[PDB]
């Protein structure tokens, strides 16, 4: 055992014994601002609040209603053959991190293609504050003030408000974000697998060549590698494990992770704290809105960077 | 640089660019419980609140008044020859970590011996948990700790009494009643910059002749203690060059001020002569920072 490995062992053993990040707390009532700050924000600890929201959207947001309310405008949509936008796929003996095929099409076309269980996998996943930038009308059916219990801890308005509408086959592969995340399912349900930052040494991460999904004149999908001016591949660091069916012989370290499963239904709120690993699945035609707030830096970020150094 | 040292250098580089724990925040008024939780508790960030308390004590309490109040009672007094209780001391060519000679003498003699610079260094340290204090003024912090104080300690002592650098595993709310207290503080993540050593523990004892000496303490093979080796006021940067990378903070806390010293922060304390203070300890609520700190301790072992 190296000294670095001994230190990582100490970290994991202490966090296990102290029950750090070992569960998703489940509440039936929205907590006070002080409660949220003390018990979840300051501990970097996820919580799900059941049936917290009765926004008008939760009732009325249907694909048909959205087509009418948005005037059937053209929307940006991501397409993959496999359902893994921003995810690993193999071609000609090489594993790539692949970006989705991104295109524009009328919302009605998106919905028609969500109804074809055979064709390519579609997802309105653009994030980048796509709700407030590209679909501001939708904001009228939300009451963001209801999120105050959490916002007072972040102490700033959302840095992004995002809209998700997805196929059942669209899976978000495990990754982390540098934001505090308040996730609100409007219709259907989302299934989360979550892993806390301090378990970084149990999550295998690899450096992969990057590609993008393109389609041939025949409509056949393939991966086009991104190979830049310097000649080399364009590389991306990405989580290597599939949480739904992990290969513990290939990745012994993942045996030491304790992933947490939570399902979030229409009207539920999920607080996903900054730098938590998450893998996301969804019911068919699931609609969700999420609010991202920039993180307030402390020593835990510096420790996380140190862990990245140690596990490199 | 080795693997462990490359990791520590990454830690310190990231904390230096973000200036983590680079300043003791200064406040004019007592914050809300939410403000304190969001800004200070959750960030492990020390803060000093100026002229925050208007307790009766701050006016009344003196050696003279305390005499008449408790009535010349016998009190728990700590005594040292050098003024370094829980500090390092040399004897027989070997450096020891020495606990204080603890005794019980009546409080009128304490005051007499305080202004004799000829004698030993004395100070009173009591853990009794009154009507001259408005403890509710600290609710803002209590609500963030979500439990009453685990201890309330009274302190009265000599300017010669120096509390050497060390860390505590609890949240500290320090309230100065009379005089001022000088703190040198160091963030926990700078542990690798603070040189530590293993020392044989002892206790101070007086002779037939009243002469002080360190009695090596034992359980046989005698006990040992890990203790910080550097003196922050006159550091030896040639003997301890890693300490050049630490960035200590200095803060003076006056009568009526409140200092929040977060758990596991290194601190070296001094004070004016006959300074009086109280402080409230709260047992920490364990989080990821503590686990990282145990890891960091393993890396600097
Ligand atoms: Mg796998
Ligand atoms: Mn994400
Ligand atoms: Mn202390």
Residue numbers in the entry:
A (entry chain A): 1 to 312
B (entry chain B): 1 to 129, 139 to 228, 231 to 312
Provide text from the study.
Jumonji domain-containing 7 (JMJD7) is a JmjC (3S)-lysyl-hydroxylase that catalyses the modification of Developmentally Regulated GTP Binding Proteins 1 and 2 (DRG1 and 2); JMJD7 has also been reported to have histone endopeptidase activity. Here we report biophysical and biochemical studies on JMJD7 from Drosophila melanogaster (dmJMJD7). Like hsJMJD7, dmJMJD7 forms a homodimer with each 316-amino-acid monomer possessing an N-terminal helix-loop-helix-fold domain (aa 1–42) that forms part of the dimerization interface, a core distorted double-stranded β-helix (DSBH, aa 160–294) fold comprising of eight parallel β-strands and an α-helical C-terminal domain (aa 296–310) which is also involved in dimerization. Notably, the crystallographic analyses on dmJMJD7 combined with previously reported crystal structures for hsJMJD720 reveal the unusual dimerization mode of JMJD7, which involves interactions between the N- and C-terminal regions of both dmJMJD7 monomers and is likely conserved in all animals making JMJD7.
We obtained dmJMJD7 crystals of His6-dmJMJD7.Mn complexed with its co-substrate 2OG or co-product succinate; catalytically inert Mn(II) was used instead of the cofactor Fe(II) to block catalysis under aerobic conditions, as was done for hsJMJD720. Comparison of the dmJMJD7 crystal structures reveals a flexible region (aa 123–138) located N-terminal to the DSBH β-strands, which normally forms a loop around the dmJMJD7 active site and is likely involved in induced-fit during substrate binding. Compared to that observed in the dmJMJD7.Mn. OG/succinate/N-oxalylglycine/2,4-PDCA structures, this loop adopts a different conformation and forms a non-DSBH β-strand extending the major DSBH β-sheet in the N-oxalyl-D-alanine and N-oxalyl-D-phenylalanine complexes. Notably, in the 2OG/succinate/N-oxalylglycine complexes, Trp164 is positioned to form a stacking interaction with the methylene groups of 2OG/succinate/N-oxalylglycine; the C4-methylene substitution in N-oxalyl-D-alanine or N-oxalyl-D-phenylalanine compared to N-oxalylglycine prevents this interaction. Tyr123 is one of four dmJMJD7 residues positioned to form H-bonds with the 2OG/succinate/N-oxalylglycine C5-carboxylate.
